[PDB]
């Protein structure tokens, strides 16, 4: 179902609506594109523009609040646009960070219309969209050099999300009505280089599963069982993948690992009966 040459500039992200019927591509050309996919067809609708620097990542909001797609660019700003009347418009612009923003994912509709922003400005922001338009932002420093990922943890307070460091550190953050904002929990060390990406699973089974990919060219699957329980570092393999590792994605169900390399190859992984990993 290829959509050959969607952009002019190299593409940095390919995400779909909750109903895999409409896509969203973003590139360096500072532009994002909306799509329609059927059997093998690709209808190109609008092309989102207002981004000064290369767009990095984008994320589809839950249909619960209509059609909304958020994008983050080098321009140190993340922007969201809705699709009222089949015509794409820019609803709000979030630019609190001072430097590139490399990741932006939406919170489980349960939580609400929340967006988690992680900038290379070393900080991270949490923003929910009220009514009138003016939101109440929440920012908290998260890493030394910077921040590269900010995946969320499923619903359960009890609001958690993992961060990937520019300083090689993976962290866990849980809300706190007494602290007024998300505070640190874990600080799982493991990578020798920078944490390129970290995604948290929705697999509600007995134990929690977290993925961490990095310039150190390895994935460390962080498995923990309960509050007490510490996270068990686990090398996806006791060798190095020839190139870096940029993305890690969790399948809806069946909990399978989508590990987008850098050697330009995508690999899939599963945890056999023991607790190790194998292809698919």
Numbering used by the authors: 2 to 157, 169 to 292
Question: What does the study report here?
Answer:
In eukaryotic cells, newly synthesized proteins are transported from the endoplasmic reticulum (ER) to the Golgi apparatus through the action of the coat protein complex II (COPII). Sar1 recruits heterodimers of Sec23 and Sec24 to the membrane, thereby forming the inner layer of the COPII coat. Sec23/24 is an adaptor complex: Sec24 binds transport cargo while Sec23 interacts with Sar1 and recruits Sec13/31. Sec13/31 heterotetramers constitute the outer coat layer, thought to polymerise into cages that enclose the budding membrane.
We incubated giant unilamellar vesicles (GUVs) with yeast COPII proteins (Sec12, Sar1, Sec23/24, Sec13/31) in the presence of a non-hydrolysable GTP analogue GMP-PNP. To understand the architecture of the Sec13/31 outer coat we applied reference free, contrast-transfer function (CTF) corrected, subtomogram averaging to solve the 3D structure of the vertex, and of the connecting rods to resolutions of ∼40 Å (and ‘Materials and methods’). This same bend is seen in the solved X-ray crystal structure, which can be fitted into the densities as a rigid body. In contrast, there is a 45° bend in the rods of in vitro-assembled protein cages. When we analysed the distribution of vertices and rods on the tubular membranes we found that they assembled regions of rhomboidal lattice.
